[PDB]
């Protein structure tokens, strides 16, 4: 009569756990051209039916900013970047001093001194010869040596550049749990970055995510499903970045109006080096456009959400960045295979109280130091022709000014440029657990006597 | 938001007295001490545990927003100003005497 404990198998059990995520891309479509920087020459194709089911009667805890899937992305992406970087030509011959002048070609007068024409006696295919060559450069990539100039990073780890054929366009990537593990997702459209979720589902793989890189506003992320969302690991800690997620796209147009031309030289055998060609036509600044009305109305929507965390009728203000490294001082992104920076402070020139387009100046620097790293540097190759870019702005990374009094007149600025929080905007929806099929329970049966 | 207050003023307590100081605040609390001409020193952090190298005599308590700090067996070398702190706001210092 007394119950005996007995064995069961295939029983669902969940434990929080971490494993390396599977690589995936849709149908390996990148394979049609060679080749994407992150898809590499190969990845696993996605399942034709990435099915998910809503679990009956289930809720689950989630912890944004605790999930290490994000951290895996941080180092996987970096590793990929270096993986394609490694088979390329070093540019250290270019540390030789260059003569320069402020060359113009019907330059607008707000572009003056932004470009320099410079030259050096290089190296040649034979060690015994030298030749003089010149190219255009952005002022940002040089510094006067003491006019004579040197590349800005010659007092830092070496600059490299080759293999322009690789594509820097993002491609969505999906991740899949190892067998015996599973991906769980929160289905609540309004979910807070942490705590239990009233509705859950599970899926074979994550939704695809592009490897988007930006430093002030999120670009081309998932839309908030119903309303603009604001999240922080702890809103009272102002060292924390404030997530802002739009529930609608905001169109932005960006261009590099100058026709671009290119030339190349040989540093030595096997050592092609791309360099800017002389530019034909009027010289004009890079710029972007966003609707005045859309920016205003959606900003007010952010404010309406923002008020949820503060006393009623609190004064709210936005502001120009407090400065720092250029990567956060200005908005930056890569489009068209070329880096851009812009002055976004005009977008924040507002205040808020109770109760047709904007244009922004931009800049280009071809010497880049990725992320926060200082051990590497690279030269972007010139991009021929006029650059045209169109994208949807999907959110903001914001910070809040410290101090003040009486819980009032809060203010905000762009900030948070660490790439980890771009990824968090997509991955907060997911957690991964370990499946333990084994389990036991009491029974009225006994093994047969033999 | 920040609700910090403190009541210790200053204390005249004699040597060897166990003594306490209290304050109240919304959120996490850190305790510190300082002497003139010197940088402040952490004593308690995260509403609980002593900073490493703090003497065993030091202790404290948390309940609700309440916070307590005490020193068992107080000695003249322990005379200092004291603080309660939250990420930015700091209660004005209070101090031992004898």
């Amino acid at each position, epitope marked *: 009569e007394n119950l005996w404990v007995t064995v069961y198998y295939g029983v669902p059990v969940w434990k929080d756990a971490e494993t390396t995520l599977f690589c995936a891309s849709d149908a390996k479509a990148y394979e049609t051209e060679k080749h994407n920087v992150w898809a590499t020459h190969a990845c696993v194709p996605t399942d034709p039916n990435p099915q998910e089911i809503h679990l009956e009667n289930v809720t689950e805890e989630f912890n944004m900013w605790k999930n290490n899937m994000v951290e895996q992305m941080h180092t996987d992406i970096i590793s990929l970047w270096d993986q394609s970087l490694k088979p390329c030509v070093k540019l250290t011959p270019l540390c030789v001093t260059l003569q320069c002048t402020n060359v113009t070609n019907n330059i607008t007068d707000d572009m003056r001194g932004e470009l320099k024409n410079c030259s050096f006696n290089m190296t040649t295919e034979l060690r015994d010869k030298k030749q003089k060559v010149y190219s255009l450069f952005y002022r940002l990539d040089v510094v006067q040596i003491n006019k004579e100039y040197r590349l800005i990073n010659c007092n830092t780890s070496a600059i490299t550049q080759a293999c322009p054929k690789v594509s820097f366009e993002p491609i969505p990537i999906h991740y899949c749990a190892p067998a015996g593990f599973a991906i769980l997702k929160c289905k609540d459209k309004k979910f807070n970055g942490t705590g239990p979720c009233p509705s859950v589902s599970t899926v074979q793989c994550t939704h695809g995510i592009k490897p988007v890189v930006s430093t002030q506003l999120l670009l081309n992320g998932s839309l908030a499903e119903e309303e603009v969302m604001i999240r922080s690991e702890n809103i009272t*800690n102002n*060292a924390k970045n404030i997530l802002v997620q739009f529930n609608t796209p905001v169109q932005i147009n960006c261009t590099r109006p100058n026709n671009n031309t290119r030339k190349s030289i040989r540093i030595g055998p096997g050592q092609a080096f791309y360099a800017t060609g002389d530019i034909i036509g009027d010289i004009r600044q890079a710029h972007c456009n966003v609707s005045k009305a859309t920016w205003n109305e959606t900003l007010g929507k952010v404010v309406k959400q923002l008020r949820k965390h503060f006393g009623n009728n609190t004064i709210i203000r936005f502001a120009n960045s407090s400065g720092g*490294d250029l990567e956060v001082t200005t908005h930056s992104f890569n489009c068209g295979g070329e880096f851009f920076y812009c002055n976004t402070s005009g977008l924040f020139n507002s205040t808020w109280i109770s109760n047709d387009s904007i244009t922004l100046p931009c800049r280009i620097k071809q010497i880049i130091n990725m992320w926060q790293r200082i051990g590497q540097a690279m030269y972007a190759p010139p991009i021929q022709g006029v650059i045209r870019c169109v994208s949807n702005i999907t959110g903001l990374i914001l910070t809040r*000014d*410290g*101090g003040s009094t009486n819980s009032t007149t809060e203010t905000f600025r762009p900030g948070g*440029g660490d790439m980890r929080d771009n990824w968090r905007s997509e991955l907060y929806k997911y957690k991964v657990v370990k499946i333990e099929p084994l389990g036991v329970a009491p029974t009225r049966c006994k093994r047969r006597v033999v | 938001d920040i609700q910090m207050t403190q009541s210790p003023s200053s204390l005249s307590a004699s040597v060897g007295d166990t003594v306490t100081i209290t304050c109240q605040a919304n959120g996490y609390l850190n305790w510190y001490q300082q002497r003139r001409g010197k940088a402040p020193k*952490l004593l308690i952090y995260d509403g609980s545990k002593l900073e490493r190298g703090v003497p065993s005599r030091f202790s404290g308590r948390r309940w609700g927003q309440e916070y307590n700090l005490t020193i068992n067996n107080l000695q003249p070398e322990d005379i200092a100003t004291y*603080f309660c702190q939250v990420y930015e706001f*700091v209660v004005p210092g209070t101090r031992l005497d004898l």
Partner: nanobody
Amino acid sequence: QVQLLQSGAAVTKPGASVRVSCEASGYNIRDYFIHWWRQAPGQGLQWVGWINPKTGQPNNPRQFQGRVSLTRHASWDFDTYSFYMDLKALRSDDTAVYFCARQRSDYWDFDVWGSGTQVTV
């Protein structure tokens, strides 16, 4: 040596710009926020701001806007860092001890400070 270096005391006539500084120590600087504090004599300590050394990014109270900034610098071999606080508008009530601090934790534990310096006007 984990301890921060601290720059010496100074005095200027009012309205002067002023600079103070601190330096790196054996802990990895990249992993912690730098904070500045000031104290008027006869008064409790006041927070000034913080800077994220990895990004060079300052945060200050509305009270000090447009008056101060924080900067940082590092050795080309990255074994040192410098930190600075600049104020462009001294006034007699700006006399204070000024010092650096490290944010050890997300509870803002500050287990180290520079000795501080005395700025006077």
